[PDB]
Structures are given as structure tokens and as C-alpha cells.
Amino acid sequence: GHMQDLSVHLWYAGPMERAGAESILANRSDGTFLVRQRVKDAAEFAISIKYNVEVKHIKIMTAEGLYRITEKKAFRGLTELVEFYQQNSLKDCFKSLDTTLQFPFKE
């Protein structure tokens, strides 16, 4: 509500699935990323990035209210968490990664 609103972004898919999330990202160019809202427990939202003709999906955690993709590096919320990994080389937060939140999916 004019705060941490996520639907105002283009990388936020919220009620989206894995195959669905990558549907756009896979179709989109490399670096394309998005975030969905759903899980089961050890997480809240899920981040999906198109890197290497593939879409890497991860279940964000809500540590003390902070959102984190790797759980090692978190932020205030999603925007702050997704609008930072775009600079923070995933290779440091993720694993065999070598990029960052390049582009959204609604773009």
C-alpha cells in the first residue's frame, strides 16, 4: 500500500509456480528474474532468475522478518532483497552462479 508493495514491480510474480515462473524467464533473455509468493515452511517468497538458458528458482526465507535467497544474505523485504542481489554477484550468495538479478519478467 505505497510501502513495500511488490505488485508495483516487474520482477514480482507472487502467486506464481516454478514452471510458470521460468515460463517467462526461460522465454525471456538471460539475466531475467522474478519473485513468486508461496512455499511450505522454510521460506516465504521464491526468487527465479534466467541465467544460462535456464531459470534458477530459490525459496526466500523470512529471517527475523528479513528476506534472503541464500539465507546468508537477507534484506528488509523482497524489493530490498531482490533489488540488491541485482548488484550482489549471485556467485557469492548462490553457488555455481555468475550473475545477478539482471532483468524482471513483467518488463
Binding site: 521460506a43 521464491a46 526465507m61 541464500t70 550468495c93 548462490f94 553457488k95
Partner: peptide, 13 residues
């Protein structure tokens, strides 16, 4: 499993 975020990176090992 492969259909969901199989915890790719976070606290493995």
C-alpha cells in the same frame, strides 16, 4: 521435488 525450489543454495553441508 525437482518441480519445487530444491534448496539449490543456502546452508548445504
Amino acid at each position: 521435488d525437482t518441480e519445487v525450489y530444491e534448496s539449490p543454495y543456502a546452508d548445504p553441508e
